[PDB]
Symmetry: none
Subunit: 578 residues, 2 copies
Amino acid sequence: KDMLYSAQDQAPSVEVTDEDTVKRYFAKFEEKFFQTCEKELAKINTFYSEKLAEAQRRFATLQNELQSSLDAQKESHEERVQHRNIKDLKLAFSEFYLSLILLQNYQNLNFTGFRKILKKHDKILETSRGADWRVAHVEVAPFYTCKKINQLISETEAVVTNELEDGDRQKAMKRLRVPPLGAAQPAPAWTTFRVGLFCGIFIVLNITLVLAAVFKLETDRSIWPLIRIYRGGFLLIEFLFLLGINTYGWRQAGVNHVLIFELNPRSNLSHQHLFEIAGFLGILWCLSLLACFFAPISVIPTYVYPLALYGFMVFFLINPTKTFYYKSRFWLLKLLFRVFTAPFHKVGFADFWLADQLNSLSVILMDLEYMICFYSLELKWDESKGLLPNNSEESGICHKYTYGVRAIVQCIPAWLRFIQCLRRYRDTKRAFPHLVNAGKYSTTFFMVTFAALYSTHKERGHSDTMVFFYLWIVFYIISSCYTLIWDLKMDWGLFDKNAGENTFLREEIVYPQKAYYYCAIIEDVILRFAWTIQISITSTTLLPHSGDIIATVFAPLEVFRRFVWNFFRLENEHLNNC
Amino acid sequence: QYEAFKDMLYSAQDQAPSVEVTDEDTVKRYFAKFEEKFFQTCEKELAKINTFYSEKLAEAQRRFATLQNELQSSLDAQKESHEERVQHRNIKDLKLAFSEFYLSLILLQNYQNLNFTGFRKILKKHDKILETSRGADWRVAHVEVAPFYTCKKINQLISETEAVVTNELEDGDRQKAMKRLRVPPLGAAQPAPAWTTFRVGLFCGIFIVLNITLVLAAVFKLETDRSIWPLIRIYRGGFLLIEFLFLLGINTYGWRQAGVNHVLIFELNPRSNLSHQHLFEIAGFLGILWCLSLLACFFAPISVIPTYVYPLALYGFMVFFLINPTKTFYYKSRFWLLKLLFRVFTAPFHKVGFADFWLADQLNSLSVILMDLEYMICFYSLELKWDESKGLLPNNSEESGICHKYTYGVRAIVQCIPAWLRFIQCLRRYRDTKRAFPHLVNAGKYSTTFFMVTFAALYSTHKERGHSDTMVFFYLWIVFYIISSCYTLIWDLKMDWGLFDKNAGENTFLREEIVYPQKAYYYCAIIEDVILRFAWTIQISITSTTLLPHSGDIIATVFAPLEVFRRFVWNFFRLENEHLNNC
């Protein structure tokens, strides 16, 4: 290690003084190596002596206890008491044996490391004194060679088994099977192989798809409904990948999230499996999309391909068997059932988190509405007309705002969150947080309803159309600026008035670099105000087909904002509470 | 004894009726019979246990005596850098033997303990059933006093031998002794980091998608106007090459499955080897490079450098990767392969090792690559005019056949390079050993290929001229085919795999001892070898059933990924037999 790199890179000057200086330097290096080896040997000997003394004391105590138990036996409440005493003595003996074995293993590992270091130094520096000294003194240590302690412990355990357990040798051996200790939690290699395979298939399919789209696909076709349908799956796969990154970060951070999540000591999930399912969903989505554009199979109508996709994903969750990781799917199903009712059931952090994530996941809620509209009152199912090359407003009455069919679905997550907030107020009997969150979420109601009001009144040309707009924009900030002040003060718990050596941040954190925290703050600030671009473009000339294109670009970003929000929210409550 | 006790208990339960079902006299007679049977079973179990313990003690004593004799021989050899390598091999073999003896002793002790525990449990169950107290006395008299469990001197002797080996030989190197005498060694990979397997999966997926998109593009997008066939001629070898690597990967997996020592026979560093996933990912890398090159040649998107850049660029990247002087991309293995090639081609000078002739045989079934290289050299150098675009030339021109005929006969010499090198190597081996029983016959077998190719070319060059007496030459050619083929089969069977041995025994059509789990593998491998080695014969069948001109050329390509298949299977048991003897 150090000898190969540092000593070789030292490169002392060949001609710096008389040869006496070079000889003295070589002698000093040899003496320093010898002194370091002697210090290591002395430390190893002291540790071995301490471990031997502790083991001897523990063995004496255990032998006294075993002799007393054997004398009492040789000479029912008494029988139960004796059994409990024997079990406790066996547990204490096992613990002492484990401690002594750990000490001996540590001493042996230290000796082996010292020998390896001495050998490496001798080989790199081309010296033979250190290796000879290690072989003569360190290598011949009787403490490591002496294994009679293990034999004595085995004899004591066998005597206890014979006198007390009456010949139960197999049970004693199984209970006291301790020698090559060591364990870990490595992920299966097959899982890694599968995730890499799916990642590669996804990458190659994505590039070939985009190449075909830019070259082979032509403009005159109608694309808007197609992307309108597929953005749902795109957001789903992005969200799955993003949660996988979340859970990997949490695991690497060492936050004991499992305790607050009261989950089974398996977490029911591992980031590799989330990456796997994300890759699988991406493969299905891309294959379906490419099939839709190409339509290779004869003259099959293209308005049937996406359906299976949607079916498939629900088909992945509604499998009644005990395959496809039957422990997480049932968990998510039962939690989602608990959420969508709300007042009837009690309050849980998982329900809160799921509602919070579904709040941002707006598009994946009215995308189904668009799908059902298009396939209900805009399709040609009875006949066989599967191209739809033209566009109009009447055919597409639902991609607009018009009725509340959009406002209600938009506010469904908002209504949920409002209701759990009120339930938390009722069962908690706490005023400030619930009462401020009620308005913090009802401002979304006000915003969306005022926007719908403008949308429906503009079609007629009423004067007050130019009045409500004034409210809408300000009704924007009353939401946005408010949400932000909720996000740092309590959600992330920043901007502490009792700031310390750190500026605008809590005095204690878990992540290494505070500049990451500052960048997270600035990116949250930038991302939350994304709707300004909408009015900026709709305060000038109206580009054709500019409506939904604004939604498309913001769609990944809205979910992307959720990423930074999870990390701090989980840790802020964790660190503040304890 | 546990199975007999369980069967006796089940029989007693079946013969046991309800309390009021049977009379008292019948119950008493059945109980007396059961007690006598239990006594007889206990006595027989004690006798069998004593016999088994005596046999185990005798086997342990024999193993200890063999280990002591081996240690004495090693000490005598040491008392009285090739010598260093021999000493290292002897030390490794002695360490392996000592570890095997210690593991066998531990397994015998564990088996004796398990047998005693099972006998005690059976006695307790019998006592519970029949309500008798003699079971405890029998267990005390037999289970506790078992000689195999009581004899722990094997462990002490093994420890003393290990300490003596560490002191006298290793000069106090206790770490090496502990590593060599450790219970676990081979088996669990050791698991590589997930990045390696992730790269393997990424590359294999990219390969599969490029393959499928390439075949779809070829079947659909291609326009049938140009003879694509010459193109295959300049790619086939690369294909074979990449396929070759893939197979060897699985090969090493087999080596890690049966547990046979293969790193030692290669004198490679025991602490550093090339795990299969690295070979797999190199295979994926070269395969995806080949696929993209083929696709680019197939579509030709950029019309400035039409066709000349693709194969040359592929092979240039190949050679640049192979001899990369940087300290990455598994540099150690690449320099090792370069040194091996240097040693094998410098055959008459340096000593012949295992890897030398292994890879000589490897290249023997790789000569298609050599033919491809000479053909592409001929095309690019002799008749091709560089100042051209694409190369869309109808085959109506008389200019063809310049590199298609044999002319000087260069095809035979490049074909027979492996034969000549193997001939020289085996003759040198004879010169080194002064024994000709297993060597000059190998020389003649390999020299048969000389007559093969020479007479094939002779009939080819005399076919167009007529000379109806050339049918004698045809008969000669086919009879050399027959003799070469049969000699190759008899060598591969009797010698290379040791099967068809006159000492067969109950293992019909096999040797006395095997390692690989199943025998069906051996049989199917035998039938596979015998079928595939006669591949050329199928070729002639086609010319006896078809009269289409230039038919044979297209036939060759399907035969190409077949000699790689025969060696892939042949390579497996080749190591197994060489495990026993030494070269």
